[PDB]
């Protein structure tokens, strides 16, 4: 029922009980659950809701989580039944639990853990203790096409059956339509087909409490289970992956976006894992190692997804991989998987346990529901503000700096309606002066300055005018590494311009000042990921609540405002606040570029010279 004010009148279906202060939870029948962080029972309720509910908003006081069938299946995979969860909700719900919510839980829980998929001898078997449901599944024509049949066309016959590998993904979508999700249970200790690997954990490795908690959530009943884990950048995600690989100790495959990530993973395994270097191989197009004896492999999506003809050695590597049975596979930046080519890689590789690690999951193409069956439910996602309080991560100080557009630029901004309009507001002379002032301020403050600019031309123009290193499309790898190492150590270099390549193509040296000038157009996940990757915990400023500094230069009254607001949606959902600043104190005293009008007019000439073709 809907009130005239737009609020849904839930008073009738939520009978309140007098245990107000003791019970901290509100259970709306829409599926949303509200928790008060100031309650003395916050920690227990937080831990309980993490397993059972998907977080939505985590601000300072009132947190909102959501209930999904995927969340319920994940909780079941943890090992929690319906009765205990319902009792705990009742002991914490301020009002009566709606029956429809209760009915929804009843419907989901019963159907969980019914259908199991097992990979043995390069054959996928669907089994269940209830052949009635199994026989029912035989009715589906899509299942009939997916179910492996004889070479004569005849379908094959605790009863199970082999399934076509190339038809697995379409079957997975059908399981949701059949309301019988697959059970990704792995014989963590009962495996005998795949021999172990002499890889252990070096004593220098330390698992933070949230890291160990997430690992224990993943390893239900001591058995590895495929899933998705969300860790903020700089929280030792690579350490967590190495730890999980050492724990499973079976055949381990890792996938990264670029060869730089591959090298980072190899260094991490050398830093923490006890596996011999000879058993570590990278399937890279430049550094090639034989797949033989490669206990743990690190590769990239493009190498495996190279649909065009590859090198003959690559053919041998692919054949060895297909022959090899993978107990464990590791995927990074899971938000990239929903692409068709990278999705095909999952079909290509035969792996038992597939774990995905990433910092964000808000795909602007909303291709995440199907991702729940590509890998599994989201196992864990840490509270960023909580890690800020715990000191694990730097407490970011975020600002939105409004730079008014020059009227001549603004008149031309209105004049252009096409994609060329981007260059108009991305090249604001007032924005340039503000950036110059901020750079001077932070250099006098002796801070590492990272200037993010998606537009190549704008980035090069800014860097050349300010006489600073710039990173762009080609970015020859030797020069890139040279500039990075100069930035890390040379005190003369503390201002680096990085184009869109800085998101995932390479590791970003730790900095404290991150200035964003150019936007993708609303990539709320990409820019947030890049921000989290840029800024990490810094010693010395641990006590202060603002040890990391981020500033977004936004052109006022432009379409950049809407993009910035849409982009910061996720970060606000993460509890991060953005203060709006218009007037920058100290700019008038300092002398900056484009002080005279014709200088800005000359810049306008230069930008307009770059027409729509550029």
């Amino acid at each position: 029922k809907v009130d005239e004010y737009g609020a849904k009148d839930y008073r009738l279906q939520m009978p309140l009980k007098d245990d107000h202060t003791s019970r901290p939870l509100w259970v709306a029948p829409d599926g949303h659950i509200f928790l008060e962080a100031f309650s003395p029972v916050y920690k227990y309720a937080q831990d309980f809701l993490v397993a059972i509910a998907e977080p939505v908003c985590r601000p300072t006081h009132v947190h909102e989580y959501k209930l999904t069938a995927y969340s319920l299946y994940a909780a079941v995979s943890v090992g929690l039944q319906t009765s205990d969860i319902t009792e705990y909700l009742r002991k914490l719900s301020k009002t009566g639990v709606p029956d429809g919510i209760m009915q929804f839980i009843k419907l989901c829980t019963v159907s969980y853990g019914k259908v199991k998929l097992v990979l043995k001898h390069n054959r996928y078997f669907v089994e269940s203790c209830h052949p009635d449901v199994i026989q029912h599944l035989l009715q589906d024509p899509v299942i009939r096409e997916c179910r492996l049949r004889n070479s004569e066309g005849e379908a094959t016959e605790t009863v199970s059956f082999e399934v076509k590998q190339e038809m697995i993904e379409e079957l997975q979508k059908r399981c949701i339509h059949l309301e019988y999700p697959l059970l990704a249970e792995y014989d963590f200790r009962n495996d005998s087909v795949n021999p172990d690997i002499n890889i252990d954990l070096k004593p220098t490795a330390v698992l933070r409490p949230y890291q160990e908690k997430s690992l224990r959530k993943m390893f239900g009943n001591g058995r590895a289970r495929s899933g998705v884990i969300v860790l903020p950048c700089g929280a030792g995600k690579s350490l967590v992956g190495v730890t999980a690989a050492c724990t499973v100790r079976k055949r381990c495959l890792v996938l990264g976006n670029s060869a730089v990530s591959v090298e980072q993973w190899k260094a991490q395994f050398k830093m923490w894992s006890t596996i011999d270097d000879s058993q570590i191989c990278r399937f890279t197009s430049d550094a090639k190692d034989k797949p033989i004896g490669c206990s743990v492999a690190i590769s990239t999506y493009s190498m495996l997804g190279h649909t065009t003809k590859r090198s003959w050695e690559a053919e041998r590597v692919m054949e060895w991989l297909k022959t090899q049975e993978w107990g464990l596979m590791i995927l990074d930046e899971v938000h990239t998987i929903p692409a068709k080519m990278f999705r095909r890689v999952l079909t290509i590789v035969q792996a038992h346990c597939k774990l995905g690690l990433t910092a964000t999951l808000v795909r602007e193409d909303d291709k995440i529901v199907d991702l729940n069956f590509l890998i599994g439910p989201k196992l864990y996602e840490a509270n960023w503000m909580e890690l800020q309080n715990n000191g694990y991560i730097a407490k970011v100080q975020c600002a939105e700096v409004w730079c008014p557009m020059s009227p001549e630029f603004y008149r031309e901004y209105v004049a252009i309606k096409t994609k060329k309009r981007i260059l108009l507001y991305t090249m604001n002379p007032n924005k340039f002066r503000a950036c110059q002032f901020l750079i001077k301020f932070h250099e006098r403050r002796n801070d590492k300055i990272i200037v993010f600019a998606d537009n190549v031309f704008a980035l090069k123009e800014y860097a050349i005018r300010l006489n600073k290193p710039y990173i762009y499309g080609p970015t020859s790898q030797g020069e890139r590494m040279q500039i990075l190492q100069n930035f890390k150590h040379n005190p003369k270099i503390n201002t680096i311009f990085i184009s869109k390549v800085g998101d995932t193509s390479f590791d970003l040296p730790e900095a404290n000042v991150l200035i964003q000038i150019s936007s993708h157009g609303g990539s709320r996940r990409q820019e947030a990921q890049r921000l989290g990757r840029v800024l990490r915990a810094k010693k010395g400023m641990v006590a202060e609540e603002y040890n990391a500094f981020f500033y977004s230069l936004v052109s006022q009254d432009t379409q950049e405002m809407a993009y910035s607001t849409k982009r910061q949606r996720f970060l606000v959902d993460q509890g991060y606040s953005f203060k709006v600043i218009t007037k920058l104190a100290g700019m008038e005293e300092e002398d900056l570029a484009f002080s005279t009008k014709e200088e800005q007019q000359q810049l306008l000439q230069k930008v307009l010279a770059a027409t729509d073709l550029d």
């Binding site: 831990d47 309980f48 943890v78 705990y88 914490l92 160990e212 690992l215 390893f219 009943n221």
Partner: peptide, 15 residues
Amino acid sequence: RWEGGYERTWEILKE
């Protein structure tokens, strides 16, 4: 080797 199992259900109890 603590990864075998982990539950906090009893911590969620009436007091």
